[PDB]
Design a protein around this ligand. Structure first.
Ligand SMILES: NC(=O)c1ccc[n+]([C@@H]2O[C@H](COP(=O)([O-])OP(=O)(O)OC[C@H]3O[C@@H](n4cnc5c(N)ncnc54)[C@H](OP(=O)(O)O)[C@@H]3O)[C@@H](O)[C@H]2O)c1
Ligand SMILES: NC(=O)c1ccc[n+]([C@@H]2O[C@H](COP(=O)([O-])OP(=O)(O)OC[C@H]3O[C@@H](n4cnc5c(N)ncnc54)[C@H](OP(=O)(O)O)[C@@H]3O)[C@@H](O)[C@H]2O)c1
Ligand SMILES: NC(=O)c1ccc[n+]([C@@H]2O[C@H](COP(=O)([O-])OP(=O)(O)OC[C@H]3O[C@@H](n4cnc5c(N)ncnc54)[C@H](OP(=O)(O)O)[C@@H]3O)[C@@H](O)[C@H]2O)c1
Lengths: 298, 294, 297
C-alpha cells in the first residue's frame, strides 16, 4: 500500500498520495456510488482526502458528508484536509472574487466544514490562498480557537510565498503542517523561487496539486515534446502511462511532495499509486525537465 | 485629531498621517506663510513631518527652519523625520547622482539637518536609499554615535528590500523604526513581493510615500471605482478613498500627505473616519490592476 | 605581496586575488612551463588557486597534478579550491547536461580531485551550481565524511541563492566559507538581488568569477561607453590599465570579494594584482556603474 509520511515535525501522518475531491461535482456520483469509490481508493493506501471551502460552489464538502453518513465506518480510516480563505462569486454577497482571512470568517468556515462532512474534526485546515489584507494575528487566533476545540488537529497554508509562510509562522506555537503548492513538469517556478527550498529546510512536506497541469497535459498541443519524452522514459522505466512518469518526476524532488490525484476513475487512481514503485534516474529527470521547458539547466 | 501610532517595537509614536515637505519649494511660500501652514496641519492632528537631506535642491530643510525660527513653540508639537544617503547633481561637487552611506558623512549630514531645521535633535533618521556600497558596520557606527549625542532618537531605512533591511538591522542594537516605501493602487508591487510581509511580521509600520493617479488617463476605470466607492462610503473626494485604501493594509501604513493646499491636507486626514469594506478594497485593487486575485 | 584575507568566521585564509585555472588547457602550457607560471604567481602573493570537477573536459585538475608532481614543494604554499556537482556532455555517460549532488558522488569526486591534483587534501570544496534535486542531508553528509577523513578542510557553495545557501547551511555544523558568484561591472544582478547582502551579513567573503566578463569587456562592441569610462577613471586614478580599474571596482564592494584572475599571461597576472593600491571613490564607482548599465539609481 502507499507508504505513510509525517508531513511536518509535529505534523500528522498522511498517505504519500492524497485523493482530491475538487471535481467531485463533475464525477456525478450518488452517495451510494461515492462511498464505493472512497472504499476502493483507501484500500490502496490512499487515506488522505483533500477538500476545500469554495469547492464545487460550496457543494463538494456537503456532497462528501452524505457518503460518510451512510458509511460512517469510514471516517477513522482517513485524514480530511480542507481550506478556507476565499470568497467565490457563487454567493450573492460576493459581487467580486476576493479573500476573507478575517478571524471570525475562518472559524465560521471551519465549523461549517465539520458540519458538511458530517465529521467532528478536521485533520488539516489550510488557509486556501495568500491575502494582501491578511493579518497574521487574526489568523493565529482563529487557529488557537479551532485547536482548543478539538475541531482541527493541524494547520497549514496554500500557495504561500516563503515570506508569507514565515509571516504567519511567527504567530504560531506549532509548525505549519504543509504548504499545498502546484508542481508539475509544466509548472516549475516553485522549484527555484525558494518555496521548495524553505519547505525542505523546515522539513515540511508540500502537497502538490495539478501534477497533470489540470489535465491539459494530454490535451494542450503545446506539450508534445514533453509527452514524447515522457513516453520514451516510460519505456525505460517500464511504466504504464506517461502520467506515472510525471507522478514520479514530481515524487522525486528533495522536498518530497505528496501528489494529489484528481481523477474520478478508480482505475486511473490505481495506476497513479504505482508510480511510487518506479525508480527514475537523475538524467531521466533532467531529460523530462528539458523536454517540458525547451532549454538546459544553468 | 488624527490617530496616534507607535511605528515599531521600542519605536516612536507618530501621527497616523504624515506631512511631506519634498515639494515645499513648489508651494511658493514665505516663512510668514509657512508658519501658518505648519500651525494649521498640526492643529489638524498631523504632527509628523517628513524631510530629507536633498529635498528642494538641498534647501527644503533650511526653509522649514526659518518658519520654525519665527515660531519657537512649534518644534515640540511635532516629530521630525529626515533622511540621508543620496547625492544629487545639484551640488557642484557631485558630477553623477549617487549615494553616500559612509560613517563620517551620515553624521556630517545628520548634524546639518539639525542646523537647518532649527532644532537640537531628529526623531527619526532614515537611510534614504539602499546603497550597493553600504557597509552595515560603518552605518551602524554613525547611528550609534548620533544616538549617544542625543541628536537622533530613532533610526530607520527607506526603499529597502527585506534582505537589505535585515543586513542593516543585524548590525543594530535597536529596532529599526520604519521603512518608508511607496504604496498606492497605482503601485502595489510591495503588497506581495515580501516587503510588507517582513514589516507586518516585525510589527514595524511603513510610512507609505506617494500614496499622477488623476493625471494619467490609463487610470480612468480606477478613478471610476474610487468615485463609485466614495459614493458608497460617503467620501468627500476619491482621494479620501485612496488614502483609506492604503490606510487599511494589515501592515498599517502612515500615509504621507504631499499637498501644499491645507484644504487637501484636512480632506486626506478625514480619510480615517471612512469604513471601507474588504470587497471594496479588492474592487479598487482590480480596477487598478485590471485582473482578479489568483 | 597581495594582502591576506580570512574568507569566513572560522574559515580559511586565502589571498585577496585567487588564480583560476578554467582555461588552463587553452594556455597550451607544458608541465615544465606551468610549474614556472604557478611558481611566479605565488611569488606575487596569489597563493590560492581555483579549480573544478569539469574544467577543461575534466583535464585541468590532472594537468595541475603534473605541475605539482615535478615540483611538490609548492603545495604547502598554496590553497586549493575545487568543485563538483555538475555533469557535462564532455563525458559519454551524460546524454544531457545536468547536476549530480548525491552523497556518494560528492565523496567520489573529491577523492578524484586529490588524485588528479596529486595532493592528500583540498583546502575548500564547493558544490558548483545549485541543483533542483539537491538534498541537503545528503550533501551535508558527504561533507562531514570528507571532513573527518582530513581530505577537505573547508566547504562552500557556488552560484547559490540566499535560500539555497540558507538551506544547505541548516544541515552543516560548519560555516560555509564562501559563495563563489559572478561579479563584474558587466554582471550586477547580485549587487541588488540580495545575494551579496546575505554574504556581508554573515561575514562570508565571496570569490568572484569572470570579473572581466570572460574577456568580452575588451571585445564586445556593446561595451564602448564602459571602456571609455574605465579609461577616464584610469588616468584619474593613475591606474595601469582599464582591467585594474575593473578589479578595483570589484574590491571596492562591501562584501569584500576575492577576484579570480583567469589570464594565462603572467604579466597580466602581475598587472591585475596591482589594482590593490588604487583608491577608487564612490562617485567614480557609480560612474563606472552607469557607463555599464545606462541609467542612474
Ligand atoms: N490549493 C489550491 O489552490 C488548489 C487549486 C486547484 C486544485 N487543488 C486540488 O489539487 C488537485 C489537483 O488538481 P486537478 O486540477 O484536480 O489535478 P490533476 O491531477 O492535474 O488532474 C488531472 C485531470 O486530468 C484528467 N486525466 C487524468 N488522467 C487522464 C488521462 N489519461 N487522459 C485524459 N485526462 C486525464 C482527470 O480527469 P478524469 O478522471 O476525471 O477524466 C483530472 O481532471 C485537485 O483534486 C484539488 O483538490 C488545490
Ligand atoms: N523615500 C523616498 O525616496 C521619497 C522620494 C520622493 C518623495 N518622498 C516623500 O513621499 C511623500 C509623498 O510623496 P508626494 O510624492 O510628496 O506625495 P503624493 O501623495 O504623491 O502627493 C500628491 C501630489 O498630487 C497633487 N494632487 C493632489 N490631489 C490632486 C488632485 N485632486 N488633482 C491633481 N493633483 C493633485 C498634489 O499637489 P497639490 O497641493 O500641489 O496641488 C501633490 O503634489 C512625501 O513625504 C515625500 O517627501 C519619499
Ligand atoms: N563558479 C563558477 O561557476 C565559475 C564558472 C566559470 C569560471 N569560474 C572561475 O572564475 C575565473 C574567472 O573566469 P575567466 O572566465 O577566467 O575570467 P575573466 O577574468 O573574465 O577572464 C578575462 C579573459 O579575458 C582575457 N583578457 C585579460 N586581460 C585582457 C586584456 N587586457 N585584453 C584582452 N583580453 C584580455 C583573458 O585571456 P588572456 O590573458 O588569457 O589571453 C581571459 O580569457 C576562472 O579562472 C575560473 O576558475 C567559476
Amino acid at each position: 500500500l502507499v507508504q505513510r509520511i509525517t508531513i511536518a515535525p509535529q505534523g500528522p501522518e498522511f498517505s504519500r498520495f492524497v485523493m482530491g475531491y475538487w471535481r467531485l461535482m463533475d464525477w456525478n456520483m450518488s452517495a451510494r456510488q461515492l462511498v464505493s469509490f472512497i472504499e476502493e481508493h483507501l484500500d490502496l493506501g490512499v487515506t488522505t482526502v483533500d477538500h476545500a471551502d469554495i469547492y464545487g460552489g460550496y457543494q463538494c464538502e456537503a456532497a462528501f458528508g452524505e457518503a460518510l453518513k451512510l458509511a460512517p465506518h469510514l471516517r477513522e480510516r482517513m485524514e480530511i484536509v480542507s481550506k478556507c480563505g476565499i470568497a467565490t462569486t457563487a454567493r450573492e454577497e460576493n459581487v467580486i472574487g476576493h479573500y476573507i482571512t478575517d478571524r471570525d470568517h475562518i472559524i465560521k468556515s471551519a465549523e461549517q466544514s465539520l458540519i458538511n462532512l458530517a465529521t467532528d474534526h478536521l485533520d488539516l485546515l489550510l488557509i486556501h490562498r495568500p491575502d494582501p489584507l491578511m493579518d497574521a494575528d487574526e489568523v493565529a487566533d482563529a487557529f488557537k480557537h479551532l485547536h482548543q476545540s478539538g475541531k482541527v488537529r493541524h494547520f497549514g497554508v496554500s500557495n504561500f510565498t516563503p515570506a508569507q509562510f514565515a509571516l504567519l509562522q511567527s504567530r504560531l506555537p506549532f509548525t505549519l503542517a504543509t504548504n499545498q503548492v502546484e508542481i508539475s513538469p509544466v509548472h516549475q517556478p516553485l522549484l527555484l523561487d525558494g518555496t521548495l527550498d524553505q519547505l525542505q529546510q523546515l522539513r515540511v512536506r508540500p502537497m502538490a496539486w495539478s501534477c497533470l497541469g489540470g489535465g491539459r497535459l494530454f490535451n494542450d498541443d503545446y506539450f508534445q515534446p514533453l509527452r514524447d519524452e515522457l513516453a520514451v522514459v516510460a519505456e525505460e522505466l517500464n511504466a504504464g502511462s506517461i502520467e506515472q512518469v510525471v507522478n514520479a518526476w514530481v515524487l522525486r524532488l528533495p522536498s518530497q511532495p505528496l501528489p494529489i490525484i484528481g481523477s474520478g476513475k478508480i482505475e486511473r487512481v490505481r495506476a497513479a499509486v504505482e508510480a511510487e514503485t518506479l525508480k527514475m534516474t537523475r538524467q531521466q529527470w533532467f531529460r523530462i525537465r528539458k523536454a517540458a521547458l525547451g532549454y538546459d539547466v544553468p
